[PDB]
Short mmCIF file of N, CA and C in Angstrom, two decimals:
data_model
loop_
_atom_site.label_atom_id
_atom_site.label_comp_id
_atom_site.label_asym_id
_atom_site.label_seq_id
_atom_site.Cartn_x
_atom_site.Cartn_y
_atom_site.Cartn_z
N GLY A 1 135.14 85.98 104.59
CA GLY A 1 135.73 87.25 105.07
C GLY A 1 137.20 87.10 105.40
N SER A 2 138.02 87.97 104.83
CA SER A 2 139.46 87.90 105.01
C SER A 2 139.93 88.98 105.98
N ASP A 3 140.04 88.61 107.24
CA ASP A 3 140.52 89.53 108.26
C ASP A 3 141.85 89.05 108.81
N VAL A 4 142.87 89.89 108.71
CA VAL A 4 144.18 89.60 109.28
C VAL A 4 144.71 90.80 110.05
N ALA A 5 143.82 91.75 110.34
CA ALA A 5 144.22 93.00 110.97
C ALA A 5 143.02 93.72 111.58
N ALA A 6 142.23 93.00 112.37
CA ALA A 6 141.11 93.60 113.07
C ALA A 6 141.61 94.41 114.26
N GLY A 7 141.66 95.72 114.09
CA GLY A 7 142.11 96.59 115.15
C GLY A 7 143.62 96.71 115.18
N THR A 8 144.30 95.57 115.06
CA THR A 8 145.77 95.51 115.06
C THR A 8 146.31 95.74 116.47
N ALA A 9 146.06 96.92 117.02
CA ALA A 9 146.45 97.23 118.39
C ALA A 9 145.36 96.77 119.36
N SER A 10 144.64 95.72 118.97
CA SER A 10 143.59 95.16 119.80
C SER A 10 144.20 94.62 121.08
N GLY A 11 145.31 93.91 120.93
CA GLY A 11 146.09 93.50 122.08
C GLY A 11 147.57 93.43 121.76
N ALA A 12 148.39 93.90 122.69
CA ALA A 12 149.83 93.87 122.50
C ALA A 12 150.46 92.89 123.47
N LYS A 13 151.79 92.99 123.65
CA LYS A 13 152.54 92.07 124.53
C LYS A 13 152.58 90.67 123.93
N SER A 14 151.91 90.56 122.79
CA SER A 14 151.74 89.34 122.03
C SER A 14 150.75 89.66 120.93
N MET A 15 151.27 90.09 119.78
CA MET A 15 150.46 90.77 118.77
C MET A 15 149.24 89.94 118.40
N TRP A 16 148.08 90.40 118.85
CA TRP A 16 146.84 89.70 118.59
C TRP A 16 145.73 90.66 118.24
N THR A 17 144.96 90.30 117.23
CA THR A 17 143.81 91.06 116.83
C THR A 17 142.55 90.31 117.22
N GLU A 18 141.56 91.02 117.71
CA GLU A 18 140.34 90.39 118.18
C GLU A 18 139.49 89.93 117.00
N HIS A 19 139.15 88.65 116.99
CA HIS A 19 138.32 88.07 115.94
C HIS A 19 137.15 87.33 116.55
N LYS A 20 135.97 87.54 116.01
CA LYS A 20 134.82 86.78 116.45
C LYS A 20 134.06 86.23 115.25
N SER A 21 133.57 85.02 115.38
CA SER A 21 132.72 84.43 114.37
C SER A 21 131.30 84.94 114.58
N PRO A 22 130.52 85.07 113.49
CA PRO A 22 129.15 85.62 113.52
C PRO A 22 128.23 84.98 114.57
N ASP A 23 128.63 83.83 115.11
CA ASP A 23 127.86 83.16 116.15
C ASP A 23 128.15 83.73 117.54
N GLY A 24 129.09 84.67 117.62
CA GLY A 24 129.36 85.33 118.88
C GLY A 24 130.57 84.77 119.61
N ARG A 25 131.27 83.83 119.00
CA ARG A 25 132.49 83.28 119.60
C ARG A 25 133.69 84.15 119.24
N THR A 26 134.33 84.70 120.26
CA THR A 26 135.49 85.54 120.07
C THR A 26 136.76 84.81 120.47
N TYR A 27 137.75 84.83 119.59
CA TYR A 27 139.04 84.24 119.85
C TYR A 27 140.14 85.24 119.52
N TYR A 28 141.38 84.84 119.72
CA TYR A 28 142.50 85.74 119.52
C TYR A 28 143.35 85.26 118.37
N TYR A 29 143.75 86.16 117.49
CA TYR A 29 144.62 85.78 116.40
C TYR A 29 145.95 86.47 116.58
N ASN A 30 146.99 85.66 116.69
CA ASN A 30 148.33 86.16 116.88
C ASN A 30 149.06 86.16 115.56
N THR A 31 149.41 87.35 115.11
CA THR A 31 150.02 87.54 113.80
C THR A 31 151.42 86.96 113.76
N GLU A 32 151.96 86.71 114.95
CA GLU A 32 153.29 86.15 115.11
C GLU A 32 153.36 84.76 114.50
N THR A 33 152.40 83.94 114.87
CA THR A 33 152.32 82.58 114.37
C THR A 33 151.27 82.47 113.28
N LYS A 34 150.53 83.57 113.11
CA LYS A 34 149.45 83.66 112.13
C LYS A 34 148.32 82.70 112.47
N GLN A 35 148.19 82.39 113.74
CA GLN A 35 147.20 81.41 114.18
C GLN A 35 146.09 82.05 115.00
N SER A 36 144.98 81.33 115.09
CA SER A 36 143.87 81.73 115.93
C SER A 36 143.82 80.79 117.13
N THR A 37 143.77 81.37 118.32
CA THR A 37 143.97 80.63 119.55
C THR A 37 143.00 81.11 120.62
N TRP A 38 142.86 80.32 121.68
CA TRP A 38 141.98 80.66 122.79
C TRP A 38 142.55 81.81 123.62
N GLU A 39 141.78 82.26 124.61
CA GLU A 39 142.26 83.27 125.55
C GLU A 39 143.58 82.84 126.17
N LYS A 40 144.61 83.64 125.94
CA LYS A 40 145.97 83.29 126.32
C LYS A 40 146.23 83.45 127.81
N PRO A 41 147.11 82.59 128.34
CA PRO A 41 147.70 82.70 129.68
C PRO A 41 148.40 84.05 129.93
N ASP A 42 149.16 84.09 131.02
CA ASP A 42 149.92 85.27 131.49
C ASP A 42 150.79 85.97 130.42
N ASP A 43 150.68 85.58 129.15
CA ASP A 43 151.40 86.25 128.07
C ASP A 43 151.00 87.71 127.98
N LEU A 44 149.73 87.96 128.26
CA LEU A 44 149.18 89.30 128.18
C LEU A 44 149.53 90.08 129.44
N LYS A 45 150.02 89.35 130.43
CA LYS A 45 150.50 89.94 131.66
C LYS A 45 151.89 90.53 131.45
N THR A 46 152.91 89.67 131.54
CA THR A 46 154.31 90.07 131.43
C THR A 46 155.16 88.82 131.19
N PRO A 47 156.20 88.88 130.35
CA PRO A 47 157.00 87.69 129.99
C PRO A 47 157.47 86.88 131.19
N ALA A 48 157.95 87.55 132.22
CA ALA A 48 158.44 86.88 133.41
C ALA A 48 157.30 86.26 134.22
N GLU A 49 156.11 86.82 134.10
CA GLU A 49 154.95 86.23 134.75
C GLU A 49 154.59 84.91 134.08
N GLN A 50 154.82 84.85 132.77
CA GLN A 50 154.50 83.67 131.97
C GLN A 50 155.28 82.44 132.41
N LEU A 51 156.55 82.63 132.77
CA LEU A 51 157.50 81.51 132.90
C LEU A 51 156.99 80.41 133.83
N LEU A 52 156.25 80.79 134.87
CA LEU A 52 155.72 79.82 135.83
C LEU A 52 154.50 79.11 135.24
N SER A 53 153.73 79.86 134.48
CA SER A 53 152.52 79.36 133.85
C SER A 53 152.88 78.52 132.64
N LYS A 54 153.45 79.19 131.65
CA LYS A 54 153.82 78.59 130.39
C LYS A 54 155.10 79.22 129.88
N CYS A 55 156.01 78.38 129.41
CA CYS A 55 157.33 78.83 128.98
C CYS A 55 157.24 79.82 127.82
N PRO A 56 158.13 80.84 127.83
CA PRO A 56 158.17 81.90 126.81
C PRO A 56 158.36 81.34 125.41
N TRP A 57 158.95 80.17 125.33
CA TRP A 57 158.92 79.39 124.11
C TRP A 57 157.75 78.44 124.22
N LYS A 58 156.76 78.58 123.36
CA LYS A 58 155.52 77.88 123.58
C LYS A 58 155.01 77.17 122.36
N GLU A 59 154.19 76.16 122.61
CA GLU A 59 153.56 75.38 121.57
C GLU A 59 152.06 75.31 121.83
N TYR A 60 151.27 75.78 120.88
CA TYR A 60 149.82 75.67 120.98
C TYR A 60 149.24 75.33 119.63
N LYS A 61 148.00 74.89 119.63
CA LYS A 61 147.31 74.59 118.40
C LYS A 61 146.25 75.63 118.13
N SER A 62 146.16 76.02 116.88
CA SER A 62 145.16 76.96 116.41
C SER A 62 143.76 76.34 116.44
N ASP A 63 142.76 77.08 115.98
CA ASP A 63 141.43 76.53 115.79
C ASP A 63 141.48 75.43 114.73
N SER A 64 142.43 75.56 113.80
CA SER A 64 142.69 74.52 112.82
C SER A 64 143.51 73.39 113.45
N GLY A 65 144.05 73.67 114.62
CA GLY A 65 144.76 72.66 115.38
C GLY A 65 146.21 72.51 114.95
N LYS A 66 146.75 73.52 114.29
CA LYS A 66 148.15 73.50 113.91
C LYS A 66 149.01 73.91 115.09
N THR A 67 150.00 73.10 115.43
CA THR A 67 150.92 73.45 116.49
C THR A 67 152.04 74.33 115.97
N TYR A 68 152.29 75.40 116.69
CA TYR A 68 153.41 76.28 116.39
C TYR A 68 154.22 76.54 117.64
N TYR A 69 155.52 76.71 117.45
CA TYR A 69 156.44 76.94 118.55
C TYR A 69 157.13 78.29 118.35
N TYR A 70 157.04 79.17 119.32
CA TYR A 70 157.53 80.52 119.11
C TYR A 70 158.31 81.03 120.31
N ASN A 71 159.28 81.88 120.01
CA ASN A 71 160.04 82.59 121.02
C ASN A 71 159.30 83.89 121.33
N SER A 72 158.60 83.97 122.45
CA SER A 72 157.73 85.12 122.71
C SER A 72 158.51 86.40 123.03
N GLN A 73 159.60 86.29 123.78
CA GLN A 73 160.36 87.47 124.21
C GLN A 73 160.94 88.23 123.02
N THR A 74 161.41 87.48 122.03
CA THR A 74 162.08 88.06 120.89
C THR A 74 161.20 88.01 119.66
N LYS A 75 160.10 87.28 119.82
CA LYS A 75 159.05 87.16 118.81
C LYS A 75 159.53 86.49 117.54
N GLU A 76 160.34 85.46 117.71
CA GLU A 76 160.70 84.57 116.63
C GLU A 76 159.69 83.43 116.59
N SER A 77 159.41 82.90 115.43
CA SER A 77 158.44 81.83 115.32
C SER A 77 158.98 80.69 114.47
N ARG A 78 158.74 79.47 114.92
CA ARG A 78 159.26 78.29 114.25
C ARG A 78 158.28 77.12 114.37
N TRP A 79 158.53 76.05 113.64
CA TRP A 79 157.89 74.79 113.96
C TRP A 79 158.97 73.77 114.30
N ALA A 80 159.04 73.45 115.59
CA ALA A 80 160.03 72.56 116.17
C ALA A 80 160.04 72.80 117.67
N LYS A 81 159.87 71.76 118.46
CA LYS A 81 159.73 71.95 119.90
C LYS A 81 160.68 71.06 120.71
N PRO A 82 162.00 71.16 120.51
CA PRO A 82 162.95 70.43 121.35
C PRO A 82 162.96 70.99 122.77
N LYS A 83 162.86 70.11 123.75
CA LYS A 83 162.97 70.52 125.14
C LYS A 83 164.37 71.05 125.42
N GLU A 84 165.27 70.72 124.49
CA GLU A 84 166.66 71.18 124.52
C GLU A 84 166.72 72.71 124.55
N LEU A 85 165.76 73.34 123.88
CA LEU A 85 165.68 74.80 123.84
C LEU A 85 165.46 75.36 125.24
N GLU A 86 164.44 74.84 125.92
CA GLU A 86 164.16 75.24 127.29
C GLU A 86 165.20 74.66 128.25
N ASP A 87 165.91 73.63 127.77
CA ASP A 87 166.95 72.94 128.54
C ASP A 87 166.31 72.19 129.70
N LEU A 88 165.04 71.85 129.53
CA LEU A 88 164.28 71.14 130.54
C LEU A 88 163.15 70.36 129.86
N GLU A 89 162.01 71.03 129.69
CA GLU A 89 160.84 70.42 129.04
C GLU A 89 159.97 71.51 128.42
N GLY A 90 159.46 72.38 129.28
CA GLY A 90 158.55 73.42 128.84
C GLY A 90 158.18 74.37 129.96
N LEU A 91 159.20 74.91 130.62
CA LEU A 91 159.02 75.92 131.65
C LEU A 91 160.37 76.56 131.96
N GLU A 92 160.38 77.87 132.19
CA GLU A 92 161.63 78.58 132.41
C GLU A 92 162.01 78.52 133.88
#
């Protein structure tokens, strides 16, 4: 099954469509990184709420375990995680 747009407006503030496997496991797919990921932190809350939890520039692994690094505020996506970007390590 080829799903890349289940609902689409399933969740915003971080473009994610709700996906579940026939076994009843539901995960989130973020079209930004094109990855499938677990229930996200304060990203679904508000960008400034995230900063204490997880930096707006973030690195996570998909269900395939691919790490992606993305600028959440501006919604740019890359693969490269220099702490130089955060100018620290991984928190705003």
